[PDB]
Each structure stands twice: as C-alpha cells, then as structure tokens.
Amino acid sequence: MLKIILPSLMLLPLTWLSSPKKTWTNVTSYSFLISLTSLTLLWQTDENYKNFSNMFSSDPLSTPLIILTAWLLPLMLMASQNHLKKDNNVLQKLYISMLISLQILLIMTFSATELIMFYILFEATLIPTLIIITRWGNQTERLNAGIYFLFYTLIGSIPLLIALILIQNHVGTLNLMILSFTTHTLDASWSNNLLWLACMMAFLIKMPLYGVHLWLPKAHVEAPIAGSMILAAILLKLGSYGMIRISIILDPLTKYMAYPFILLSLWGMIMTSSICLRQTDLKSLIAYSSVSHMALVIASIMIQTPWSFMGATMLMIAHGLTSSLLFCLANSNYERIHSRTMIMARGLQMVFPLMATWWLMASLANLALPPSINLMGELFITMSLFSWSNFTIILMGINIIITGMYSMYMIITTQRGKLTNHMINLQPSHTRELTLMALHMIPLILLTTSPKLITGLTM
C-alpha cells in the first residue's frame, strides 16, 4: 500500500507549493494518476489475499472500497472548484488539503490489518469531515449538523473502543487474520450480549441504522458538495465494512442478536423511502434515499449468508457512485438558483437537455434498473432475505414500489412540466459539470460489464 499512500501524501506539498493558477490543474491530474495506481490491487490471480506487511493488506472487500476512495478524490476536486472560486488562495489550498486528508485516512482505514489501527483511522476521519461541513457549509444549521455528526459517531465509538481493548486483553492481539483463524464459539451470556452490542453499535450508527439516522439528513443538507460526496459514497461504508470485519468473532450470538436490527432496517427502509415522497428539499430527499438503501446493507450483513454478503458488497459500491452522482446533479441547479427546494426549478429538460439525460440515468440507477449493479446487489439481498424468512419479500416489495415512485417523482418534478421561466440565470451547463456526471456514470456502466470485481469475499 505504500506505493499508493506515499504519492497521496505528496499531494499535500504539491497543493501548498503550487502556484495559485496551477493548484487545481496539478492536484486533480495527479489525483487521477493515483486512482490509476490503485488498480494494481485488482491483479488477483489466486485465492490468497494480499498481505503487504504486518500493517497493510487488501482483499476483495477492501480493494473495491480503496479504489472507489481513490476515484472520488479527483471527482470531489472538480465538484468544489466553482463554489470556492471566491475564496482566497490559502483558503482554497486548505480545502484541498482536507480532501486529500480524507483520501489518505480512508485508504489506510480500508487496508489496516489490526482493529485498533482501524479504529484510530476510523475516528481520525471525523476531523477533516467536521471541518469541511462547518467551515464551508452555507447555512447557520451547519454548526448543529457538525455536532450531531460528531457525537452520534463518538457515543457509539467509545463502546467500540472498550470492546476492542477487551478482545485484545483476552486474545492477545487485534490482528484480523489471527482473529479469524483462532476464533472460538462465544457463550450466550448477558456479558457477551453487551459485548456484541459494543462491537456493533458504532458501525450501525455510521450506516446509519434506522432510529439513529437523524445525523445524516442534517449533515447532507448543510455540507458542501464535496462533503456530501464523500459522506454518502465512502463514509457510510465504514460501518458496513466494519460490521463485516468484526462479525467473524461474534458467533453464534448474531443468530439472535441481529433480530432487532433486521427489524429496524426492514421496517425502517419503508419509513425512510416513504419520507422521500413528501420531502421538499432535494438534498434531504437524496439523503433519506441513502438511509433506505443502507438499511438493506444492514439486513444482509446481519443474516451472514454468502449471497447476502455479495449483494451487500455490490450495493455498497453501486450506491456509492449513484448517490454521489445525485448530489452532484442537485448541486448544479443549486449553484444557479441557490435553493435546495425541489419544487422551485421545473421543466429543466427544456434548457439543460444533456444534464437531464444524466438526471435520468442517475434516477434509473437509483431505482435499480437491470442489469445495473444497483439491481444486482438489491436482487441478491432480496434472495438471501427470502431464504431467511419468506415474509421479508412483503417489505421488500413495498420498498421497491416506493423507490420507483420517488425516483421518478424527482425527475418529473425538476426536469419536466413547464419551465419556471422567471429563472433567467439558468446558465448553460459547464463542461466541468457534464464531465463530472460522466465520471460517475461510466464506472457504473463498466462495473455492470464486469461485476466479478465487486462481489466481495464470499463469491
């Protein structure tokens, strides 16, 4: 991993030692080249996972998440340029450094071999995330959004820290490979049931689980666009990735311990998807859509089947690209009229025909049109849950209906109908903006062509 991490660290001096007129062109270009180098992790010609050293590894679960992380950094930079163009030069460089910091921290997080190392990097990400939300968010509610985000995470993370220390005191190590091979059955004591919850809650809050999700709609509505991109695409996946790594040592208590969280997720995914039908704020709508999708990820990880893990891995990647695309699409209208109210701008297909095409594909991805990886992940999750209990299809069926309703509702409301023609400041789409949309959507199509790369650990 050092041949990926070291060049990423060199982006920081590159940012600060570049001329003001070359900073964006420089950092974006090398960020693309670093994404290219991360593809080396996909050269996997056997079934032994790559252990580069005692500290860094990569297997079929972390490899897609590392590459998606590397790809997001250039995309976030392009997304940020227009709304930062009034900041002075030092403030622009500070913002870029925050974005690089997350890229470095997240790549290290997904390749860490030891759980307290994962925990430290997992917690470190809050610092640049909070700074981005609160220093560059637009509204007065960005400060409250920062508090919710930081402290929903932290209250769950403290029990996680206790559990990790406890496991290490008992086993002698937090190395993941050794924990895997030497794992032994747990007794079903009250003490072990609290251990299960301490190991799971921080990851479940991060997903977020329905019930403790209020931080996420707040954080998205208030964050700048690059903050929304990283939060929806990668940061939520830390919880799902954490749950998959740590659940190997929690057997057999997950068989009964999972029931309340399957119930919250399967019912909760209907509550949050139905909220999207009556949401007046476009960013909030996309955010609630994420909570509904991540509810599926929670359910499939909880039932721990080969299909359920594979469907969760695909959905994690597919949602990452799709939701980041939707935030970028919404931000392009906001940068023109400076409102997130969905019903304000209307008939936009009349004036932005190619941007409306990007809107349609993002919406078709979101409602899981086959053969997209969006549908493939949701399909295999549905099959595994049906096996777990045939009555799950009732709640799946309701969510599928509602997801089509709000996905097409967003398109009809904003792109169709009569143009709101008092909006004479609807400047034509930027080349940068149209390029940004394509950089989301080409990988989604390419991954649909070769879905072996995101199947995860079980297939």
Ligand X SMILES: CCCCCCCCCCCCCCCCCC(=O)OC[C@H](COP(=O)(O)OCCN)OC(=O)CCCCCCCCCCCCCCCCC
Ramachandran bin of 456, using left for φ above 0, alpha for ψ from -120 to 50, beta for the remaining angles: left
Q: How far is the CB of 56 from ligand X (least distance, A)?
A: 18
Residue among 134, 105, 98 at smallest CA distance from 120: 105
Which of 64-72, 250-258, 259-267, 332-340 is the region at the interface with ligand X (rule: CB under 6 A)?
Answer: 64-72
Distance between CA atoms of residues 299 and 137, nearest Å: 33
Considering only residues 171 to 190 of the shown chain, the ones binding another protein according to CB under 8 A are 174
Binding window for another protein (CB under 8 A); candidates: 15-23, 48-56, 194-202, 218-226: 48-56
Interface with ligand X includes 450 (CB under 6 A)? Answer: yes
Whose CA is closest to 273, among 260, 257, 300, 291?
291
Question: Closest approach of Cβ 117 to another protein, in Å?
Answer: 4
In the complex, least distance from residue 47 CB atom to ligand X, rounded to whole angstroms: 17
Residue whose CB is less far from another protein, 9 or 116: 116
Nearer to ligand X, 418 or 452 (CB): 452
Residue 283 burial (CB < 10 Å; 0-12/13-18/19+)?
buried
Q: Which amino acid is at 79?
A: A
Beta bridge partners of residue 341, listed in sequence order: 281
Choose the one of another protein, ligand X, none that binds residue 453, judging by a C-beta under 5 to 8 angstroms depending on kind.
Answer: ligand X
**Residue 126 binding another protein, by CB under 8 A:** no
Dihedral, CA atoms, 389, 269, 293, 416, nearest 10 degrees?
130
Binding to another protein in span 371-410, by CB under 8 A: none
Helix pair 126-136, 115-124: axis angle to 10 deg: 10
Whole-angstrom distance, CA of residue 333 vs CA of residue 269: 28
For position 115 contacting ligand X by CB under 6 A, the verdict is no
Q: Is 162 in the site for ligand X (CB under 6 A)?
A: no
33 binds ligand X, rule: CB under 6 A: no
Site for ligand X in 289-348 (CB under 6 A): 317
Whether residue 414 contacts residue 333, with contact meaning beta carbons closer than 8 Å, is answered with yes
Using CB under 6 A as the binding rule, whether residue 438 contacts ligand X is answered as no
Query: Binding of ligand X at residue 453 (CB under 6 A)?
Result: yes
What is the binding site for ligand X (CB under 6 A)?
35, 64, 67-68, 71, 317, 443, 445-446, 449-450, 452-454
